[PDB]
Design a protein around this motif. Structure first.
Motif, PDB file in Angstrom:
ATOM      1  N   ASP A  89     -12.405   6.358   5.425  1.00 26.05           N
ATOM      2  CA  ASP A  89     -13.592   5.972   6.131  1.00 26.05           C
ATOM      3  C   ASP A  89     -14.558   7.147   6.100  1.00 26.05           C
ATOM      4  O   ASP A  89     -14.223   8.255   6.524  1.00 26.05           O
ATOM      5  CB  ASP A  89     -13.243   5.564   7.556  1.00 26.05           C
ATOM      6  CG  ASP A  89     -14.423   4.975   8.294  1.00 26.05           C
ATOM      7  OD1 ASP A  89     -15.349   4.475   7.618  1.00 26.05           O
ATOM      8  OD2 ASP A  89     -14.422   5.018   9.551  1.00 26.05           O
ATOM      9  N   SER A  91     -17.566   0.284   8.043  1.00 28.88           N
ATOM     10  CA  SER A  91     -16.277   0.716   8.554  1.00 28.88           C
ATOM     11  C   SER A  91     -15.642  -0.396   9.370  1.00 28.88           C
ATOM     12  O   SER A  91     -14.447  -0.621   9.255  1.00 28.88           O
ATOM     13  CB  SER A  91     -16.395   2.030   9.349  1.00 28.88           C
ATOM     14  OG  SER A  91     -16.996   3.073   8.577  1.00 28.88           O
ATOM     15  N   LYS A 105     -10.645   9.260   8.404  1.00 35.49           N
ATOM     16  CA  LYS A 105     -12.092   9.445   8.354  1.00 35.49           C
ATOM     17  C   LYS A 105     -12.418  10.783   7.707  1.00 35.49           C
ATOM     18  O   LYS A 105     -11.843  11.806   8.071  1.00 35.49           O
ATOM     19  CB  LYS A 105     -12.703   9.353   9.748  1.00 35.49           C
ATOM     20  CG  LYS A 105     -14.228   9.267   9.759  1.00 35.49           C
ATOM     21  CD  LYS A 105     -14.766   8.988  11.168  1.00 35.49           C
ATOM     22  CE  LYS A 105     -16.244   8.597  11.155  1.00 35.49           C
ATOM     23  NZ  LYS A 105     -16.534   7.333  11.923  1.00 35.49           N
TER      24      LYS A 105
END
Ligand code: ATP
Ligand code: ATP
Ligand code: MG
Ligand code: MG
Lengths: 90, 494, 503
Positions: free
Chosen positions: B243, B159, B184
């Motif tokens: 992510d 990440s 995310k």
């Protein structure tokens, strides 16, 4: 129509260079192509581009067959005009 | 209609068309040239201020003319030739031929933020990777929709690299892609793959009408999907960072929505969900040399003595180049003394990763909190296989048959599980020739060990001794499997 | 109001009506020629952006005028004659000279990017690229071209489960640039998969949405509660604004859903497994069957996805084993590759085993298929089955797979005077409905069960019912290859002892 009007538009410079609608009102009205009021309204216009716009519209309508008018620039010593439009007419 | 070029000209030469000009002057010349309809000239001719007659002349004009010639024509005749000359000059420097850095940066910064991108790491960057990411993204801005999989070990640092790859170069955002959306995932529930895409659309949503945001919370999947694409049309070249994807459904939605996606994940196989060929970049364990760089970068003292470079090869050995657990290590090595560094080395063993668990930029106290999940997701049968890998020596290349001994069930089936096992969290290390062998590193090793049943460790050890009867760089030969005793050292410590 | 021709024109000439035009310019000319009302002009006259005034002018207009005339007259007077000329040209290449409209006045206006805009918005998935079934995608497109003329029609792209039907519709609407733009104006692709009785209504709730403007998805009402007669009437009303709109109904299971399509006079592409849903439509239905991948096509498909080519006698055979078991099954073939990670003929043969001793579950994998394994799909194909037919199928396991075998030989295991044609009737329904059986009229009426269709049943049916059916047949076996098993030699099903001992 489109041909006649396109002519009054193409030959716009000369018309809107010299020429005067007051000069033609007595004749055009004598030809009954104009009305007393029509002449009066135009007669009463401060600038000439005003008196000219009006007549062009009037011609394009009342005098669609401005042939009679095509003999007016003749009589008015503005024959260099009525000659150009007969060419367009031709 | 005037083209961009022709409309960019009416706009560039606008500071001028305001100081000296008048639409009344041109109306007759346009109507006369059959450019303006009676109502057109009425609309622009009766306007109190001139900026009105000008804005209407430039709006109305851009629609009506097949080209820009007449404008110049008129500008001339009107004694405003200093105008028709400027515009004819501009049309020519295109017809005959085929700023502040800091100020510019602010735009880049804003692009990065509004897309919810986090700040890139600075005190140490694995350029190589950040570089290769950026490269493979450049190659694709052309593409209509595509997946980039930045996969790697848990906390292997994936990440952070996406943070840096979209933060170093000034092209990816502005030049190659117009906007960024970084979301995310971390979805486990079945409602998560829909909830994600609820928030993706929000990113696209204008600042206006976040007030009007409806109870979109209740509306079908076919509709959130159709709603998003509608909004998507508004934005061009919109990159999507997702992510932490765990569920392949995210990829599936991403491919129904014809999206352009960067993807950080641990499990690589989620890509089989996408029929489109997907590119890949694996975040490997930090090489031995990169570990040094990473240490120095964060004030960590370099080796000075034979048994000091060794103290540090111990940490690297245990960490196996683990960004996240390495970082946890530093935050703990306050003395910054080769000594207290070695205290930890020993401590980490007799307490597993919990010996160095610390407050870190990682959402996680220790790598064990992360891996938890990587293990839950595992096929019920595979969850088993992983449990028995503890017996094997870590950081040793070892045969399939030697493994067939501890693992439940021609035993190729063992190999199939061990592949799924490296594919799905980088839990194992495959290696085709000289002979099919896998390997378990120490991070993973320690984790599994401390995590399991204290019994199942000892049971697997005994279950191994049984097969020990049969009838280093140099891989272990089949004449010498009867003795796993080479690793007595790394076995007695149970 | 107008129609599909006159509205297809306002739509085709839309890339243009956006670059230069303004509804304010036409409102006065139309309140006049008797086409507008003083609220109409209010509604279109106070609109912040022009694409709003344009979309309202084209919506409101299509309802109000008896024809498309004053419009042409207008773009003439408004110095936008390059517009009224294009539309009058289009109206002429329809009444007088037919056919010429697509080659002449529509074809030039193609653009690859436009399609992608239209594909995405019609919720079409991306077409497969690494292998394309030539024959099929072609024949689909062809039979769709033949029908853009038609007012409403069904195209049935029917096949076995995972047989690959849905992928072909993705490709048939993605290869040629004509189907969308030239032959049909827009696309609506909706996945059905409806089983409940509320499903056939819920579908058409999304169809209307798929239609409704980007504007007024906000205003979307609790349409969730409103009669069927109204969702139906409500849909066609908006449909007006949709000339030449095509409908892909990916995965229909219900014939009731099939129907609605015919009350709504729709133009439908249809992927399905059960073919008989077409009996619901009295409308002429045209059909295209997605067969099992031919032996040569299987090779192509393998190579396409990095799969090695046979090198040795018993290696082309290793691969004929996969093709046999897979019986050219797109979906299970794909699951195979994703699993054949070593790619070596060796690990390819390992799997060939796993398939005999674990059924389809030996190769179940994460795949572009919504399904882990073909068994998850077929589940449904079997639930839907007539209660009596569910029985017939369930016993077919005993029969040798990939063998052409007589009706009477089947009459032996299948449940139920002296004429057992009833067996044949069930076995037809059985191939018609998920294509779970093979059919062959002459030389003699015989059916056949393939292997993909076989391993599934083998591993699913009651471990007992397998062995009970095997014993049952033996009793009937007593009696008194290319060549169909002769009636002098039925007493011995022993030819297939090989493929029978493995039970
Ligand atoms: N400069 C750096 N480069 C890479 N990793 C770093 C760096 N500095 C610290 N780290 C460690 O990595 C942590 C974040 O790890 P990261 O999020 O990059 O891994 P990840 O691949 O996202 O893991 P996950 O599997 O949880 O998605 C940091 O807070 C720190 O512990
Ligand atoms: N031309 C193709 N190229 C690649 N894969 C294919 C192709 N055709 C079918 N498949 C395989 O089948 C899967 C999807 O099958 P598809 O949806 O095309 O069959 P289907 O007949 O729609 O089945 P269903 O009727 O159950 O939807 C894909 O994930 C792929 O694995
Ligand atoms: Mg992360
Ligand atoms: Mg499908």
């Amino acid at each position: 129509r489109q041909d006649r009007r396109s002519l009054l538009e193409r030959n716009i410079m000369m018309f809107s260079s010299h020429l005067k609608v007051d000069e033609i009102l007595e004749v055009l009205i004598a030809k009954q192509v104009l009305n007393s009021d029509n002449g009066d309204m135009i007669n009463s216009c401060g600038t000439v581009r005003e008196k000219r716009r009006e007549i062009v519209k009037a011609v394009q309508r009342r005098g669609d067959v401005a042939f009679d008018a095509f003999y007016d620039a003749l009589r008015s010593t503005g024959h260099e005009g009525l000659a150009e439009v007969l060419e367009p007419l031709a | 209609m005037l083209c961009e070029i022709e409309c960019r000209a009416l706009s560039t030469a606008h500071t001028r068309l305001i100081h000296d000009f008048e639409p009344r002057d041109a109306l007759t010349y346009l109507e006369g040239k059959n450019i303006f309809t009676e109502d057109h000239s009425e609309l622009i001719s009766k306007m109190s201020t001139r900026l009105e007659r000008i804005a209407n002349f430039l709006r109305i004009y851009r629609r009506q003319a097949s080209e820009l010639g007449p404008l110049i024509d008129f500008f001339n005749y009107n004694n405003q030739s200093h105008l028709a000359d400027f515009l004819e000059d501009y049309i020519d420097f295109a017809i005959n031929e085929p700023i502040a850095p800091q100020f510019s940066r602010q735009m880049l910064d804003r692009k990065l933020l509004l897309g919810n991108v986090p700040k890139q790491m600075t005190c140490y960057i694995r350029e190589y990777h950040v570089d290769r990411v950026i490269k493979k993204l450049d190659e694709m801005c052309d593409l209509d929709s595509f997946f980039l999989f930045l996969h790697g070990r848990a906390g292997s640092g994936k990440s952070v690299i996406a943070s840096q790859a979209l933060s170093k170069s000034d092209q990816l955002i502005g030049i190659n892609y117009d906007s960024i959306v970084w979301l995310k995932d971390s979805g486990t529930a079945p409602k998560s793959t829909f909830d994600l895409f609820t928030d993706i659309l929000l990113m696209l949503k204008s600042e206006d009408d976040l007030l009007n945001f409806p109870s979109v919370e209740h509306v079908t999947s076919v509709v959130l999907k159709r709603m998003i694409c509608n909004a998507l049309i508004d934005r061009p070249n919109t990159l999507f960072v997702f992510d932490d994807v765990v569920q392949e459904e995210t990829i599936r939605w991403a491919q129904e929505l014809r999206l352009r996606c960067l993807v950080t994940t641990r499990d690589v196989e989620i890509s089989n969900a996408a029929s489109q060929t997907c590119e890949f970049i694996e975040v490997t364990s930090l090489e031995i040399d990169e570990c040094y760089d990473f240490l120095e970068a964060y004030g960590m003292p370099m080796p000075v003595g034979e048994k000091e470079e060794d103290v540090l090869n111990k940490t690297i050995e245990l960490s196996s180049g683990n960004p996240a657990t390495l970082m946890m290590f530093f935050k703990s090595c306050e003395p910054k003394t080769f000594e207290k560094m070695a205290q930890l080395n020993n401590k980490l063993e007799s307490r597993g990763l919990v010996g160095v668990e610390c407050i870190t930029p990682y959402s996680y106290k220790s790598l064990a909190m992360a891996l938890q999940r990587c293990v839950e997701v595992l096929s019920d049968e595979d969850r088993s296989a992983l449990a028995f890998a503890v017996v094997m020596p870590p950081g040793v290349d070892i045969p399939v048959k030697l493994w067939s001994c501890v693992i439940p069930v021609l035993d190729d089936e063992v190999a199939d599980r061990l592949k799924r096992l490296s594919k799905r969290g980088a839990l194992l290390s495959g290696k085709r020739m000289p002979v099919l062998t896998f390997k378990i590193d120490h991070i993973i090793h320690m984790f599994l060990k401390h995590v399991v049943d204290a019994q199942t460790i000892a049971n697997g050890i005994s279950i191994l001794e049984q097969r020990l009867l049969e009838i280093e760089t140099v891989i272990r030969p089949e004449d010498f499997p009867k003795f796993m005793q080479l690793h007595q050292k790394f076995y007695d410590s149970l």
